[PDB]
Design a protein around this ligand. Structure first.
Ligand code: SAM
Length: 239
């Protein structure tokens, strides 16, 4: 089984893995298989295959939180090549997505992926969190924000919380170990106008690796001190 190889997208095995992984997460990815295949081809144009399929599926773990209803404005901060934002947008097309990265070439890739995949209501933006979150256009202007593989929670919270309108929520996607990053966090969240929401523990569907979705709730407006200047949160974190 799964022997088919294709020149320009996911292999027969790659397709099967994606669908199987989706089902384990409670998702039917059949309607999106060709879009994911094309996204994979784009990533290649820019064992390999299984790694990418895993990134697709890890991104899709966001859907294990009932946070994605209707046309919410969502920031994916430090999106890189578009994770977790592009998989999320593919499967939840009503979301109004802004994907930010400090690295121009990453942003250019995401912009091309949007154009090639024909996604509507998604845009890639070259910028620094610390700068954008002081613009009236972005500060406390999002209902949701997400980030994967960006920074320790103490730093990341200062980067994410100022984008959230009061009542909004952020998801910091984390790996197997969160104990140390979480320990000193709640007082720092308070300073930013946030509260710690749930920490959802889950196991990746094909690999069985542990993951944690850390939810940050936006409860009051972020004081004007935050975020501090580019690089400062990382050099002198709040916790
Ligand atoms: C290790 S990559 C992870 C990318 C993607 N989220 C993923 O999971 O595959 C971290 C990315 O965040 C971006 N980044 C880090 N700090 C940032 C900041 N303060 N503002 C905007 N982008 C940032 C970097 O340019 C880099 O592309």
């Amino acid at each position: 089984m799964f022997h088919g190889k294709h020149p320009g997208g996911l292999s027969e095995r790659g397709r099967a893995l994606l669908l199987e992984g989706g089902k384990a997460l409670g998702l039917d990815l059949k309607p999106h298989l060709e879009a994911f295949s094309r996204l994979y081809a784009l990533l290649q144009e820019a064992g390999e295959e299984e790694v990418v399929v895993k990134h697709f599926l890890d991104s899709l773990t966001l859907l294990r939180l009932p946070l994605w209803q209707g046309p919410l404005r969502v920031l994916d901060l430090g999106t890189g090549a578009g994770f977790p934002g592009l998989p999320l947008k593919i499967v939840r097309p009503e979301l109004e997505l802004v994907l930010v990265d400090a690295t121009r070439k990453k942003v250019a890739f995401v912009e091309r992926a949007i154009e090639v995949l024909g996604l509507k209501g998604a845009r890639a933006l070259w910028g620094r969190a610390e700068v954008l979150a002081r613009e009236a256009g972005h500060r406390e202007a999002y209902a949701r924000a997400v980030a994967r593989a960006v920074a320790p929670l103490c730093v990341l919270s200062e980067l994410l919380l100022p984008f959230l309108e009061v009542g909004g929520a952020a998801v910091a996607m984390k790996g197997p170990r969160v104990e140390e990053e979480l320990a000193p966090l709640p007082p720092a969240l308070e300073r930013l106008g946030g509260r710690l929401g749930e920490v959802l523990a889950l196991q990746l569907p094909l690999s069985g690796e542990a993951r944690h979705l850390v939810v940050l709730e936006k409860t009051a407006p972020t004081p004007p001190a935050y975020p501090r200047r580019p690089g400062v949160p990382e050099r002198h974190p709040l916790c």
